Design a protein around this ligand. Structure first.
Ligand SMILES: Nc1ncnc2c1ncn2[C@@H]1O[C@H](COP(=O)(O)OP(=O)(O)NP(=O)(O)O)[C@@H](O)[C@H]1O
Ligand SMILES: [Mg+2]
Length: 265
């Protein structure tokens, strides 16, 4: 499916804050304040939307909007079909690595092996005596953050859906593995799946079909990467003006983005 939002505004409603947490709110609800205002986007079947912004700009909230956990108080949103969501929090259920990737869905060999390879999990499971039959306890607590995120990503990607929402999978230290995953999974394997990737890496905007930048629940820019360079030259020159920005930590990339957005409103 494709996805369209026309002039969407979404207000803080009671309970939304806890849901964001479970991944003062009552004041935000009493004062009737938007979490997202005048959002517009039009994404074709098979296209990739890259979403970035300052920290706390509404990136996750926009996903919740697509999931229907947040109501569109004004404006129009259209998409059809199953959506698959990979959250910032990487949840792990009791069971093997395989059982986690396949959770609640039926096993298919070609599909599984293909997902496992593209999410770069082979490098991980090969370190284990029982490979992907290795048993994890909930939280998969002795794994690395990147290992948990790749399992969590594989699970969401293995879901058969029309639209994939990937909230910040690529935020950890093993930064070269992340580059392979983005190339192999998001760009190749899912090349023809409609997908939305929340991200603080510039390569992802550069390879994206559409770009949405958020600041203060507002749309700072929407368009192509070419239009971002010409229509937002201050932002672009500053961020493309590092040599290896994407290999900074997620905290640094995010705070640079925040400062640059604060600067050039
Ligand atoms: N744990 C929290 N405590 C207080 N306010 C929160 C919390 N989580 C979310 N919010 C509110 O959520 C609004 C939008 O949050 P959110 O949609 O999670 O933005 P975000 O861009 O995904 N944040 P981040 O992933 O850290 O860069 C913020 O500006 C906050 O007002
Ligand atoms: Mg978020």
């Amino acid at each position: 499916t494709g996805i369209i939002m026309e002039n969407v505004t979404a207000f803080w409603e009671e309970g939304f804050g806890e849901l964001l947490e479970k991944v003062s709110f009552s004041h935000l609800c009493l004062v009737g304040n938007p979490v997202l205002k005048n959002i517009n986007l039009n994404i074709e079947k098979g296209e990739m939307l890259a979403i970035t912004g300052s920290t706390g700009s509404g990136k996750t909230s926009l996903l919740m909007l697509i999931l229907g956990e947040l109501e569109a108080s004004e404006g129009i949103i259209k998409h059809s079909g199953r959506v698959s969501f990979c959250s910032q929090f990487s949840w792990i259920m009791p069971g093997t690595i395989k059982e986690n990737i396949i959770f609640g869905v039926s096993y298919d060999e070609y599909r599984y092996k293909s997902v496992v390879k593209a999410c770069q999990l082979q490098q991980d499971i090969t370190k284990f005596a029982e490979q992907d039959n290795t048993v994890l306890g909930e939280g998969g607590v002795t794994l690395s953050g990147g290992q948990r995120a790749r399992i969590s990503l594989a699970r969401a990607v293995y879901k058969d859906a029309d639209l994939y929402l990937l909230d910040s999978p690529f935020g950890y230290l093993d930064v070269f593995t992340e580059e392979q995953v983005f190339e192999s999974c998001v760009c190749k394997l899912m090349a023809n799946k409609t997908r939305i990737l929340v991200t603080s890496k510039m390569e992802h905007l550069r390879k994206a079909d559409k770009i949405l930048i958020l600041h203060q629940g507002s749309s700072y820019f929407y368009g192509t990467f070419s239009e971002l360079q010409s229509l937002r030259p201050d932002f672009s020159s500053k961020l493309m003006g590092y040599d290896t920005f994407d290999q900074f930590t997620e905290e640094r990339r995010s705070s640079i983005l925040t400062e640059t957005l604060r600067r050039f409103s």
